[PDB]
Amino acid sequence: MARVTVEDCLDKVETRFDLVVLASMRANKILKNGYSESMENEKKEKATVVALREIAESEITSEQILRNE
């Protein structure tokens, strides 16, 4: 609860349950891309908060783009 607020994301998503579903899809796609093991052990963040933050900034993803069918 340092610098990612759940109130910041409840302006984009619904129900506080949709937030969990969408954030988990985003996080799973981040983690199934590498994101570690090579050079950034203590130089990055957790995919959970990285995915939860891109929703609170209208960043790399919005709810409609989060699919990647």
Partner 1 sequence: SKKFDIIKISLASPEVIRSWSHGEVKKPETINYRTFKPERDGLFCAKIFGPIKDYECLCGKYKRLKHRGVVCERCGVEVEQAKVRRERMGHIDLVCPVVHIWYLKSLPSRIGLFLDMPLKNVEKVLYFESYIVTDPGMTPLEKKQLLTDEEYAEALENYGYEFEASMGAEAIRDLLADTDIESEIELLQAECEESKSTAKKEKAIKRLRLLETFQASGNKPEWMVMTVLPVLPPDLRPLVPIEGGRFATSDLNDLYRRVINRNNRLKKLLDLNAPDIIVRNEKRMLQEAVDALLDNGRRGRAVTGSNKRPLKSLADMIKGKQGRFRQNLLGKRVDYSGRSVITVGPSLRLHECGLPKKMALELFKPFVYSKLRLGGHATTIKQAKRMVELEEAVVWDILETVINEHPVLLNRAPTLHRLGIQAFEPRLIEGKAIQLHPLVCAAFNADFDGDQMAVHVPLTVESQLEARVLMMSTNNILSPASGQPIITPTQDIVLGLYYITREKEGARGEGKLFSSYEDVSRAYNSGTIDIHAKIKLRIDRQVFDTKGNTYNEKGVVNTTVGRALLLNILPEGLSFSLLNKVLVKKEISKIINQAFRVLGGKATVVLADKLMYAGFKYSTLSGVSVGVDDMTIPDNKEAKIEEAEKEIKQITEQYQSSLITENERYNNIINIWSKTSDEVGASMMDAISKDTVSINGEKKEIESFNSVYMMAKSGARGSYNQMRQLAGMRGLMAKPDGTMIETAITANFREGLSVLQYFTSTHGARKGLADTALKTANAGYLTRRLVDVAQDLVVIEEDCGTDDGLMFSAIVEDGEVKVPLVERALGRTLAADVVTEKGVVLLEAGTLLDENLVELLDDNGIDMIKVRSPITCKTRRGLCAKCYGRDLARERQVNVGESVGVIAAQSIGEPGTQLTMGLPRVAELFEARRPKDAAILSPCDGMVRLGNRDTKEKQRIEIIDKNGHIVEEILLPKSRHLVVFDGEQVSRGDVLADGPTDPHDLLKYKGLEEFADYILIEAQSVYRMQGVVINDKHIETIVRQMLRKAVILDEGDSKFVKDESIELVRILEENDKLRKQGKKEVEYELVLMGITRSSLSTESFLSAASFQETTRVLTEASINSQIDNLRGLKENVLIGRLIPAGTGLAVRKESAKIEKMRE
Partner 2 sequence: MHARSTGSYSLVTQQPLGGKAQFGGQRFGEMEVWALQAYGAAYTLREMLTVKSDDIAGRSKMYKNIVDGKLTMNVDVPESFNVLRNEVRALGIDMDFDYSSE
Give the interface with partner 1 as residue ranges (CB under 8 A).
Answer: 1-2, 5-7, 14-24, 27-28, 31, 36-37, 41-42, 45-49, 52, 67, 69
Among partner 1, partner 2, none, residue 52 binds (CB under 5-8 Å by kind): partner 1
Task: For residue 69, give every residue at least 6 positions away whose Cβ sits within 8 Å of its Cβ, in sequence order, or none.
Answer: none
Q: Which residue has the tokens 């709810």?
A: 63
Q: Which of residues 52 and 54 has its CB atom nearest to partner 1 in the complex?
A: 52
Q: In this complex, which beta carbon is closest to partner 2, that of residue 10 or of residue 31?
A: 31
First to last CA, the chain: 31
